[PDB]
Amino acid sequence: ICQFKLVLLGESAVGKSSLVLRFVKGQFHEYQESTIGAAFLTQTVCLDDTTVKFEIWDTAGQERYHSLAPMYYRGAQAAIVVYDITNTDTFARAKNWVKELQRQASPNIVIALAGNKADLASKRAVEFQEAQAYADDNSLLFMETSAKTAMNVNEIFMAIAKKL
Ligand SMILES: Nc1nc2c(ncn2[C@@H]2O[C@H](COP(=O)(O)OP(=O)(O)NP(=O)(O)O)[C@@H](O)[C@H]2O)c(=O)[nH]1
Ligand SMILES: [Mg+2]
């Protein structure tokens, strides 16, 4: 049995709450309310002979809550920095979340990068290749996801668990 602390960070509206909701409850709400501060959820999965329990901190992406982020990532063993593939700005913002983690978070924290809303292919702004190269250059576990279709949602959390 294993337990890990996980934190989600990213610009507001990229889909952090939706990703957690899909993984923890298998639900997706087209009408999701912006998070105020942070929400907490847990999920237990079966991973190669080991039962892993995830303690997830879903932070509010709005800038006015930025100063509170350390409270959630300081003791985190893993982080998922989320961006919206349809918005280049959210990708740039995700890079700064990564820089912050790499500089102020645990030196041994596993950092994942999630290009969310990948189901909106006809509105893509960030090419998969660019995000992959960025992730490879910064040693980030990258995956394009979709809380809406569930694409790679379970996969990203599981890949993180395997590396912990
Ligand atoms: N098409 C599509 N919409 C998505 C996806 N993930 C989230 N959304 C939608 O995007 C909107 C914002 O999602 P939400 O989870 O609230 O974003 P957030 O990053 O948690 N926001 P905040 O940081 O402000 O709390 C919601 O309408 C949600 O339904 C996805 O994979 N695909
Ligand atoms: Mg939210």
Swiss-Prot record:
This is Ras-related protein Rab-5C. The gene is Rab5c. It is an enzyme of class 3 (hydrolase). The keyword Nucleotide-binding applies. Disulfide bonds: none annotated. A motif (Switch 2) lies at residues 60-76. GTP binds at residues 12-13, 15-18, 29-30, 35, 61, 116-117, 119, 147-148. Its main location: membrane. Interacts with EEA1 and INCA1. Interacts with GDI1, GDI2, CHML and CHM; phosphorylation at Ser-67 disrupts this interaction. It catalyses: GTP + H2O = GDP + phosphate + H(+). It comes from Mus musculus.
